[PDB]
Every structure is written in C-alpha cells, then in structure tokens.
Amino acid sequence: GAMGSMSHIQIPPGLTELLQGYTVEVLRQQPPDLVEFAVEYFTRLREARA
Amino acid sequence: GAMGSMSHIQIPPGLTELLQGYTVEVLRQQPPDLVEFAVEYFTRLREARA
Amino acid sequence: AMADIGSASGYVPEEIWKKAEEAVNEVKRQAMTELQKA
Numbered sequence: 142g143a144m145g146s147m148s149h150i151q152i153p154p155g156l157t158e159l160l161q162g163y164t165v166e167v168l169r170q171q172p173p174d175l176v177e178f179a180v181e182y183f184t185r186l187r188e189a190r191a
Numbered sequence: 192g193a194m195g196s197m198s199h200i201q202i203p204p205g206l207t208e209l210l211q212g213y214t215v216e217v218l219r220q221q222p223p224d225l226v227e228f229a230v231e232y233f234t235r236l237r238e239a240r241a
Numbered sequence: 242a243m244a245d246i247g248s249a250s251g252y253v254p255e256e257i258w259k260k261a262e263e264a265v266n267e268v269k270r271q272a273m274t275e276l277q278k279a
Contacts, residue, residue, distance in 0.1 A: 165272035180233035
C-alpha cells in the first residue's frame, strides 16, 4: 500500500463535498465577491450549530 | 443555453485560485476541521487588507 | 511541462500545488452538475 514518509499528501476525503457546497452556491447566486461570499457562506454554515 | 454554458456552467473567474489558495494549506497543514479552518482563513484575508 | 506558460509563484511547495489544483478542478466540474439538474 504505502511507500514511505518521504512524501504523503493524498487528496484528503470529504474535501469535495465541502468545496461543492460553496462552489455550487456561488453560481446559483453569482455573487460579486469571493472573499466576502466565502466568509459569509462558511461562517454561517458553522454557526448553524447550537 | 446562452448566459451560462462553458463546459462547467460559469464559475466566477478567480474563484479557482481562491479555493486553491485555501486547499494548498489544508493539504500541507491538515487541520482538525475544514469549516473552522476556512472561516479563519477567509476572515484573515479580508481583515488583513481593505 | 504540459501547458504552464505562466507561473503562480508567491508561495506553496511543489507537490502541494499540483495536488491542490486538482481538488478545485474536481469540485468545480462537479458543482456544475448540481446546477445542470436545476
């Protein structure tokens, strides 16, 4: 399986669904800012808890 | 099909780099939570400049 | 080489750049499907 500690990055799992949520939302609404729309989309998502 | 069709629909230019700028950090940093690691990453970006 | 005429630079190692670029291309080509299906 593995090879060695010389190099180990491998595209982590779940990263696809995380970016999709943001990505798919950017097109559906087509916002003017990415930096803003990013913190606006990510923070809210998290805060959703409790 | 007219105001939205470029093989991938129409990803707002620059978004590719934004998602990339963060991902490169995740791969080499590997945080406990993606959402929490992002929220701070986007806030720092804006709060850092105008 | 392949088609990298320019150069991002600024930061980010090597293998870390090639990989991260794939992740965004994948999620980008994917989210578009979520749209194609309205």
